[PDB]
Each structure stands twice: as C-alpha cells, then as structure tokens.
Amino acid sequence: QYSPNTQQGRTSIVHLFEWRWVDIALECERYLAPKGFGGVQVSPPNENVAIYNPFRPWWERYQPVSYKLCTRSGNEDEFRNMVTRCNNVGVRIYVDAVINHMCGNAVSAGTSSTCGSYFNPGSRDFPAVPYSGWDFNDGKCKTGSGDIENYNDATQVRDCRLTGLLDLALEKDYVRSKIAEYMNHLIDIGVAGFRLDASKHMWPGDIKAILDKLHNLNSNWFPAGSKPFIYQEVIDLGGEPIKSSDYFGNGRVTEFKYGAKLGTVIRKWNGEKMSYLKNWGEGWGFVPSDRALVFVDNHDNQRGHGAGGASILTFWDARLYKMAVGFMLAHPYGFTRVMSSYRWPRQFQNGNDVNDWVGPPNNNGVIKEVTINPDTTCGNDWVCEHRWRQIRNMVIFRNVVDGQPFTNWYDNGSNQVAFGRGNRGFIVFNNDDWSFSLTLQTGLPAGTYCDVISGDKINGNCTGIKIYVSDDGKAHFSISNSAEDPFIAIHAESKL
Ligand SMILES: *[C@@H]1O[C@H](CO)[C@@H](O)[C@H](O)[C@H]1NC(C)=O
Ligand SMILES: OC[C@H]1N/C(=N\O)[C@H](O)[C@@H](O)[C@@H]1O
Ligand SMILES: [Ca+2]
Ligand SMILES: [Cl-]
Numbered sequence: 001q002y003s004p005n006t007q008q009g010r011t012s013i014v015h016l017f018e019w020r021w022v023d024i025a026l027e028c029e030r031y032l033a034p035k036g037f038g039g040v041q042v043s044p045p046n047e048n049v050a051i052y053n054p055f056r057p058w059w060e061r062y063q064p065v066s067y068k069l070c071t072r073s074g075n076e077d078e079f080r081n082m083v084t085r086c087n088n089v090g091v092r093i094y095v096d097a098v099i100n101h102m103c104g105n106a107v108s109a110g111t112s113s114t115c116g117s118y119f120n121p122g123s124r125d126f127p128a129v130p131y132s133g134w135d136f137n138d139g140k141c142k143t144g145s146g147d148i149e150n151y152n153d154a155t156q157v158r159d160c161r162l163t164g165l166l167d168l169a170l171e172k173d174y175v176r177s178k179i180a181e182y183m184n185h186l187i188d189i190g191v192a193g194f195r196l197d198a199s200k201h202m203w204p205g206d207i208k209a210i211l212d213k214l215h216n217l218n219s220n221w222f223p224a225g226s227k228p229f230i231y232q233e234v235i236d237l238g239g240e241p242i243k244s245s246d247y248f249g250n251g252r253v254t255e256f257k258y259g260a261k262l263g264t265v266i267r268k269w270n271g272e273k274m275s276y277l278k279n280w281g282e283g284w285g286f287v288p289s290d291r292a293l294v295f296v297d298n299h300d301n302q303r304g305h306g307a308g309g310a311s312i313l314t315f316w317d318a319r320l321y322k323m324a325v326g327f328m329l330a331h332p333y334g335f336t337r338v339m340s341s342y343r344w345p346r347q348f349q350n351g352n353d354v355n356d357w358v359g360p361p362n363n364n365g366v367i368k369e370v371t372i373n374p375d376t377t378c379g380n381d382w383v384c385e386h387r388w389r390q391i392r393n394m395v396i397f398r399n400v401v402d403g404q405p406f407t408n409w410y411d412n413g414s415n416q417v418a419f420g421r422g423n424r425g426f427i428v429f430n431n432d433d434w435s436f437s438l439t440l441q442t443g444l445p446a447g448t449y450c451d452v453i454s455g456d457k458i459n460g461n462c463t464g465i466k467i468y469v470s471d472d473g474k475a476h477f478s479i480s481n482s483a484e485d486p487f488i489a490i491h492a493e494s495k496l
Helices: 020-031 058-062 076-088 154-161 173-189 204-211 256-266 275-280 317-329 389-401
Strands: 012-016 041-042 094-099 101-104 165-167 191-196 227-230 251-256 292-294 337-340 406-411 416-421 425-430 436-441 446-450 466-469 474-479 487-491
Touching: 012 020, 012 094, 020 041, 020 446, 058 317, 165 204, 251 317, 251 416, 256 275, 256 292, 256 317, 275 406, 275 416, 317 337, 317 389, 317 487, 337 389, 389 425, 389 487, 406 436, 425 436, 425 474, 446 487, 474 487
Parallel strands: 012 041, 012 337, 041 094, 094 191, 191 227, 227 251, 251 292, 292 337
Antiparallel strands: 101 165, 406 416, 416 425, 425 487, 436 474, 446 466, 466 474
C-alpha cells in the first residue's frame, strides 16, 4: 500500500494542476514518458459546483456534487482515454479523491454543476449519488456553528464542517460503499492510486474501512495483487492533537514540514543555513521516509491557502525555487512530487493576494489547452515547471541515482554545500553571497561530465558547463553567487 506502483526506474509524480484530460494524454506520450516521469496527479475528476462569484475559482473543484466523471477537465470518455494512453506509455495516474465532504452548506440549490446534476445543499439532497440528510454529520457535530471552530479538539476537526462544507458521515456503511464504488470504478479504469483530500478531517479508522473495500489494480497493466498507492493529505506541523503518524496504517502522508522548513532555510530566514541540512529528513522531526510524500509547494500553499505560510517557495521565486526542487530531487528522503502550475495576476494588498481565487487559463470558463512553444516551454499562461530544463533534468537525476546512498557531504559552515549519491551522482550548491571555487571528492568514476543544470548532454557533447573528475574521484567546481542557477549537478548518464 506504500508503493507508488510506478514503472521501475521512474521516481517522481507531477501535479498537472487543472489540466484537461486530452492535454494530459498528449503530455504522457510526448514528454512525460520520454523524460522518465513516474506519474501524474490529476485534479478531482468528479462533478463539482460551478461557482460564478468569484468566476470559476480553482477551489470550486473541492466541492463535490456527485461522482460522475464530468468536469471542466473533460468527460468520462476523455478520462478513460487519458488513463489508457498514459498507462500504455508507462506513466501512472493518481486521482485527487475528495471524499470528506460535498459542497458548501450555503450554496444555492439548483443545477449549477459541471454536469448539470441537480443538488440541494439546504436540504442535504444530492440525488445523483444519491445522498440525503441521513448521510451527513449534522447531528454528530457538537459546535454551536456546526463548523470546525477549534483545531485543538480532535473530535470536531473530524465531525464538523470544514469552513461550511457538508461533512459526510463516513462511519455509515452506505456512505463508505458509495465512496468505494466511486474509487473502484476509477481503479478498474486503470488509475494507480489516490491522494486522499482532507484526511486530517476524517477518522483514520473510517479511511481504513473504505480502503478495505477497494479492489486490486487493473490486471491488464499491473501484476496480480497490486494495491492502490495511497497518500493522505494531513497537515501536521506539530502543536495539534492530531498526528500524521495516526494515519500510517492506511498509506503514506503528505509531509508539509518538508517544504515549510526547506523554504525558510533557502531563504535564509532567522539564522537558518544550508549547512544545517546535513541531517535532513527524520533528523528534522519528519515522518519516516517510506511513509512520506514530499514536495516544495502544492496547489494550496503556492497561493497562501494551505500550510507553510510565507516561507513556501514557488515558481514566482524562480531562482530559489529551482534550487529547492533540485535539493529535494537529489536527496534520498521520501517520494517526490513536482508541481506544475498556471500564472494568475497576483494582486497583493496589505500582505495578501486578493486574486488567490483565480482559476485556470480560460476563455469564458472553458479551460485553455496547453500550447507548446518551440523551446519546449508552455503558452496560454501555463507555467509548466516540469518542463524547465533544471527541474526536468533533476527528475532524471533522481531516477539515475535511485537506490544509491547519501554520501560525500561537504559544507563551508554557511550556505555552500555538496553531496553525492553513491557513485552515480553528485550535486553542489552555492547560496552564500560570495563565490565558490573548490576541489571536491565526488565519488564518481573518472571522466568528463555534463552539468545538467546549465545544459544538456547532446550527441557526445555538453551544451553547458563541463566537469572533469580525476582518477581519485576529485573534481573542481566553480559557482559564482551571480550565476543564474547557483548549483551544479552531474550523474552517471551525463558522462561523456
Ligand atoms: C562535438 O561538438 C564539436 C563542435 O563543438 C564537433 O566538432 C563534434 O563532432 C561533436 N561530437 C559529436 C560526437 O557529435
Ligand atoms: O487549511 C484548512 C484545510 N483546507 C484544505 N483545503 O482547502 C485541506 O484539505 C485541509 O487539509 C486543511 O486543513
Ligand atoms: Ca469529516
Ligand atoms: Cl497535497
């Protein structure tokens, strides 16, 4: 249950946030498969409320109306087509499962849904599922408002409404069955696993009951006995009665402390320095590596909607972001998820982005397709971080060094550090305000290696910086604090 089910040799998944199924299918074939990406986390594929005020925000997809595969990303046929094509090329699909709640209790009854399904929040009526008033925790929640009021009370955090979202009575067999019916439909379609949205707001035991109802993966693509990959979104930064460890029996958990701390260290906030990353991992109080799903930023906190705060690094901070992602992909801790976003007009007022609700690039509500520019970058406002040379090459770096131990660590007591992965790869970082020029032990076999951050290895030649490793495994590295990308990475496959 803790295995990603990716193809051997592929070690990361990418979140193609708000992408259309047709665009993801093409991407699997033209880019993801060729570049060695393990899989894709897709946005919720089930019908949601169509919110027009504000105009179609990204968060409307976290307010379910039914389990019909019909959204702004596409319909069920397009969804199945995407899963099939991606699987045939060795790229897995992971579904964002929104199973803790339905839509806001204050949402107007009617057919303002992505598939026209009728729903009535007021009377707890969702005929397309179907769910009724007997299927929600209204009578179970003990708060005066019916919403979660105090996170220090583990009970209301689970039984009450998260900011007004109707809370499903997950203890009922009927509700558990409708949810499992939905998930098994996806499993039989070919998905390899799920991101359980808002797991903190569900009892570990209720999740387990649901998981016990799931089938094994589609035997047309996976070996018999394969279980779906499960990673639960649990925000645990300490200081709360709920611990992410309470969920280890169901699968992996999102380690939000990872990005929050990496961000403060790289930004060099309050005395933090990269030299302190020598014992990065459990040594920093993180969950066990084999139970962790790590990432620098996620769809919520890159726009200040989750946990991590102002320390979180995103594509907006391009230079430092590439460094954080590089460190993450080079370090052996956890299973890595790469973010792929779209640009929106950030409008800061009193320290807060008033346009944090803006949905994906669109034409009157219809999501724009991902266009590919001649330099492999994307158009139509899709950022496509997964296509940035520095990030794409580190995704490959992780595959190449998979299994190799963390070794040959070096640091200058400040912000210039380096380390290798067995004898398959080596990486160097310079985050100090002065240049780095030193000869280091890399542990790599003698030869000429192409730096994969500044360039590529194309037809027996390097398009960027070249590194020369001597017989003793030593090599000289020179990185100016003025370099566009203040770090260098070389591996077994970038060797000339
Ligand atoms: C490497 O690049 C040089 C030009 O810089 C060229 O002369 C040479 O043929 C290239 N090597 C290969 C193997 O293509
Ligand atoms: O930040 C509040 C809440 N909001 C959420 N999404 O908007 C998360 O699913 C949940 O884990 C988090 O605790
Ligand atoms: Ca709940
Ligand atoms: Cl997440």
